[PDB]
Design a protein around this ligand. Structure first.
Ligand SMILES: [Zn+2]
Ligand SMILES: [Zn+2]
Length: 263
């Protein structure tokens, strides 16, 4: 079973982007004059935690206008129906992952026959596409299709002003190869390996100043938060860590491909 995350103190990352997630499953709040955008609903058990984090920062849960996700797996999206019920936020999802969201996991190319991965069915209010913007109150997020991990895995980007300076924030959706994924002659998702390769090409050439992700461990949340509490100049500005993480995951993909082809 998925390890239950622990609470994590919410904080401002940069500009109008806040962390409202856990010590593992990462969620983000973008605060605008016309309401807020929430990224990742996490597990059903985490929805009260997200609400509490939002309110701890002095914001209103009822001001959540838009709900986005990194990708259509239960650990990022299971809480979405509850959030929609409690806030009436509009749920927007990349085209290629909509089937999984509508089916609560039953159409997943890999986990269709693993009921431990299923989650509450919901409807999608707006279907997104590669390069499409999500705009609220002058804030502009861009959805980048970085497929492989899921068919519609989304890497979210935005530009943030921090201490008078401009930074591109990148929330890496995931380019991990899960244990058991088949990369050669995949029966349900034949383009899986081509998709990962495309994601690698996109991410390797992407400007990345503020390095974030769907999981805390991708981007060193805990150690960076400690630096932030100590008053360090934005430790979440980490272009070198971003470059190195993308390169590591690209290498991990090719390592797994080598194992499947030659091992
Ligand atoms: Zn996943
Ligand atoms: Zn995950």
């Amino acid at each position: 079973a998925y390890p239950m995350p622990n609470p994590f103190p919410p904080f401002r990352i940069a500009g109008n982007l806040y962390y409202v997630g856990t010590d593992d499953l990462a969620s983000y709040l973008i605060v605008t004059p016309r309401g807020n955008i929430l990224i990742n609903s996490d597990l059903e058990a985490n929805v009260p935690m997200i609400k509490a984090s939002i309110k701890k920062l002095g914001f209103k849960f009822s001001d959540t206008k838009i709900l986005l996700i990194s990708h259509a797996h239960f650990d990022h999206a299971a809480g979405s129906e509850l959030i929609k019920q409690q806030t009436k936020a509009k749920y927007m999802v990349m085209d290629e992952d909509v089937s999984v969201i509508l089916s609560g996991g039953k159409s997943d190319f890999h986990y269709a026959n693993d009921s431990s991965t299923y989650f509450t069915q919901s409807t999608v209010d707006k279907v997104l596409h590669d390069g499409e913007r999500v705009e609220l109150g002058g804030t502009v997020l861009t959805a980048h299709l970085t497929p492989g991990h899921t068919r519609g895995c989304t890497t979210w980007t935005m530009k943030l002003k921090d201490h008078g300076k401009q930074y591109q924030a990148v929330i890496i959706g995931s380019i991990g190869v899960n244990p058991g994924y088949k990369l050669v002659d995949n029966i349900t998702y034949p383009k899986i390996a081509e998709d990962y390769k495309h994601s690698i090409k996109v991410l390797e050439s992407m400007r990345c100043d503020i390095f974030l992700g769907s999981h805390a461990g991708m981007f060193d949340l805990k150690n960076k938060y400690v630096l932030l509490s100590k008053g360090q100049n934005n430790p979440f500005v980490d272009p070198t860590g971003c470059k190195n993480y993308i390169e590591q995951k690209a290498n991990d993909f090719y390592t797994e491909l080598k194992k499947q082809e030659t091992g």
